[PDB]
Amino acid sequence: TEQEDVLAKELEDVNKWGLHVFRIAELSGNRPLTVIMHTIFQERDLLKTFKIPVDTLITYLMTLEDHYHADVAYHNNIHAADVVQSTHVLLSTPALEAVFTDLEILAAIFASAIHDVDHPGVSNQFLINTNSELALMYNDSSVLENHHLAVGFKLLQEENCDIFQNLTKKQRQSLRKMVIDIVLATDMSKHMNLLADLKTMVETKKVTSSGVLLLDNYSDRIQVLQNMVHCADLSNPTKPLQLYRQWTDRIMEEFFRQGDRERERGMEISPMCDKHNASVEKSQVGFIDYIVHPLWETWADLVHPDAQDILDTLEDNREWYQSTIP
Ligand SMILES: CCOC(=O)c1c(C)nn(-c2ccc(OC)cc2)c1C
Ligand SMILES: [Mg+2]
Ligand SMILES: [Zn+2]
């Protein structure tokens, strides 16, 4: 079919920043996570390396994708597919050439795929404030992120879904630990501390004569992987403007729905969640200035000069959003 053909053509850009992820979601019948993960696993030769049966991978991916909510505007399967593909590009940065093992690459990609699974479209603070069952289960700490991990790992136990069946016990244990460490680091409450430690690493940075990073112990390696997936999660403002604007419309819809629930329950409405007192453009400039730019500038310093084009796009988009404010 022409549709299958156009999908294949779009997937040829899987190694590029700015992949048309929304078009892929449309052309695949709302299966961007499955088709992008499959494409990346084939590109990196991960099925052969880890002896993953192809039918098992597709079965797991479709099941995982089914556990992202189709009625959540932002934290859905499209976001998951986007974070996966963004991580995949960051792993190919010349400064990280041959730095991570195949197991570490597998961990970072799998963590990205599951990192928001079963997201209900409300924040950790909302779940805590409403005395939710999730906040009760997880003692108010990294409530969503613990849940995303539990669901992502539990789904491996469904029929023909154990993609790690042929890993050794030691490999399985190492991969599990890494995935947990990465997904827990996507909790925004940990952003300031992650960034501070990234800055410390940049200052004491050790590289070869070609600028390839030298990371020997687990502490430094996992820290770079955590910040990599965190950067991917917070990559929307560094993408081509047309994509960024669609991501902004989606998060604003999700936020406004949370604010509607807060308003009716008599709760104070969270920042950016009040559709009657919103300033979307000012919020984007604030988000870039206080969170996204500080993070990406630091990442760019770590892999200098490989992330220059990403930082340039971020600055271009900040300038555009600022121009929309009278
Ligand atoms: C266009 C997408 O970017 C956002 O506006 C955005 C996203 C995603 N997350 N947050 C965000 C919300 C709360 C928070 O505090 C926990 C940190 C970031 C913002 C502003
Ligand atoms: Mg999350
Ligand atoms: Zn996310």
Side-chain angles (χ1 to χ4, degrees), residues 74-75 188-189 233-234 236-237 244 247-248 251-252 255 272 283-284 287:
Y74 183 97
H75 288 106
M188 277 300 307
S189 80
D233 200 23
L234 299 185
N236 303 160
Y244 179 19
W247 288 122
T248 297
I251 195 67
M252 291 312 309
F255 281 176
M272 310 176 52
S283 289
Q284 284 316 298
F287 182 54

Side-chain angles (χ1 to χ4, degrees), residues 8-121:
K9 188 64 69 219
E10 296 287 348
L11 287 161
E12 303 194 333
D13 299 343
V14 69
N15 299 330
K16 300 180 178 47
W17 205 247
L19 176 78
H20 305 161
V21 69
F22 297 105
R23 194 66 186 133
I24 283 156
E26 290 190 86
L27 296 166
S28 67
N30 202 24
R31 295 298 193 173
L33 185 57
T34 294
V35 302
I36 283 161
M37 281 284 280
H38 186 219
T39 295
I40 286 162
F41 271 56
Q42 295 283 2
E43 172 83 3
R44 288 185 174 281
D45 212 20
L46 293 167
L47 295 98
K48 286 210 210 58
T49 293
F50 294 103
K51 304 186 166 163
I52 311 174
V54 70
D55 51 294
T56 303
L57 176 69
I58 298 307
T59 299
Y60 175 73
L61 291 169
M62 288 178 69
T63 304
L64 175 65
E65 186 152 30
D66 285 344
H67 284 75
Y68 277 91
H69 302 199
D71 60 342
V72 169
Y74 183 97
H75 288 106
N76 55 45
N77 58 319
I78 315 177
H79 171 65
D82 181 43
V83 175
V84 163
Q85 190 263 335
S86 300
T87 292
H88 162 76
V89 174
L90 295 172
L91 282 163
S92 305
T93 308
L96 301 177
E97 189 171 299
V99 169
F100 300 108
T101 58
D102 296 326
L103 193 68
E104 282 164 339
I105 284 157
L106 181 61
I109 294 170
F110 181 78
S112 293
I114 72 165
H115 93 280
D116 275 329
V117 69
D118 202 36
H119 203 304

Side-chain angles (χ1 to χ4, degrees), residues 17-19 236-245 247 313 317:
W17 205 247
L19 176 78
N236 303 160
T238 77
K239 299 291 170 73
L241 188 63
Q242 168 178 67
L243 285 167
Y244 179 19
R245 291 173 72 185
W247 288 122
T313 301
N317 293 341

Side-chain angles (χ1 to χ4, degrees), residues 34-302:
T34 294
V35 302
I36 283 161
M37 281 284 280
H38 186 219
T39 295
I40 286 162
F41 271 56
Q42 295 283 2
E43 172 83 3
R44 288 185 174 281
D45 212 20
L46 293 167
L47 295 98
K48 286 210 210 58
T49 293
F50 294 103
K51 304 186 166 163
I52 311 174
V54 70
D55 51 294
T56 303
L57 176 69
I58 298 307
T59 299
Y60 175 73
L61 291 169
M62 288 178 69
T63 304
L64 175 65
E65 186 152 30
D66 285 344
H67 284 75
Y68 277 91
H69 302 199
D71 60 342
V72 169
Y74 183 97
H75 288 106
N76 55 45
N77 58 319
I78 315 177
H79 171 65
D82 181 43
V83 175
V84 163
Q85 190 263 335
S86 300
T87 292
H88 162 76
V89 174
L90 295 172
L91 282 163
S92 305
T93 308
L96 301 177
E97 189 171 299
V99 169
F100 300 108
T101 58
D102 296 326
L103 193 68
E104 282 164 339
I105 284 157
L106 181 61
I109 294 170
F110 181 78
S112 293
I114 72 165
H115 93 280
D116 275 329
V117 69
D118 202 36
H119 203 304
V122 293
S123 69
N124 275 332
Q125 196 67 53
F126 179 92
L127 293 169
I128 290 162
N129 291 347
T130 55
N131 305 323
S132 68
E133 212 54 38
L134 274 168
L136 183 59
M137 179 71 73
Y138 291 114
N139 298 305
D140 299 345
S141 60
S142 304
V143 174
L144 288 159
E145 294 79 19
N146 273 292
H147 180 63
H148 302 320
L149 282 159
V151 173
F153 281 112
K154 280 177 171 169
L155 292 171
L156 294 166
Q157 307 192 166
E158 297 296 313
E159 189 176 3
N160 200 24
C161 286
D162 188 10
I163 63 167
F164 304 126
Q165 62 190 248
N166 293 315
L167 268 61
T168 60
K169 286 152 258 140
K170 169 175 151 199
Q171 283 181 317
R172 282 161 69 93
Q173 287 178 328
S174 300
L175 178 133
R176 183 167 160 78
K177 178 173 200 70
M178 290 192 285
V179 170
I180 290 162
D181 290 345
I182 293 161
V183 179
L184 289 179
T186 66
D187 173 354
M188 277 300 307
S189 80
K190 312 202 175 118
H191 167 77
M192 290 303 182
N193 285 333
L194 273 173
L195 182 52
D197 292 340
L198 186 62
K199 286 178 168 171
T200 299
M201 166 172 292
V202 166
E203 291 162 25
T204 54
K205 176 163 130 147
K206 286 187 281 170
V207 298
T208 62
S209 65
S210 304
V212 178
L213 288 153
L214 301 174
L215 309 168
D216 192 54
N217 62 53
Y218 183 74
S219 184
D220 294 331
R221 292 164 89 74
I222 198 63
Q223 179 180 169
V224 172
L225 291 173
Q226 290 170 315
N227 275 293
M228 181 185 291
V229 173
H230 180 52
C231 277
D233 200 23
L234 299 185
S235 65
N236 303 160
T238 77
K239 299 291 170 73
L241 188 63
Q242 168 178 67
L243 285 167
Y244 179 19
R245 291 173 72 185
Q246 296 180 73
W247 288 122
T248 297
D249 283 343
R250 281 172 175 276
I251 195 67
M252 291 312 309
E253 179 177 332
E254 188 174 314
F255 281 176
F256 292 165
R257 287 196 173 126
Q258 173 176 323
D260 285 351
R261 293 166 68 167
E262 290 170 332
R263 189 183 302 98
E264 66 198 10
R265 284 163 157 272
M267 309 172 53
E268 174 176 297
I269 301 160
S270 299
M272 310 176 52
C273 294
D274 189 355
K275 70 197 183 188
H276 302 299
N277 295 290
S279 303
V280 174
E281 298 80 24
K282 282 169 185 204
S283 289
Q284 284 316 298
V285 173
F287 182 54
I288 293 170
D289 289 350
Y290 286 100
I291 299 296
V292 182
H293 195 281
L295 175 63
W296 277 99
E297 185 186 71
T298 302
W299 178 264
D301 277 344
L302 185 71

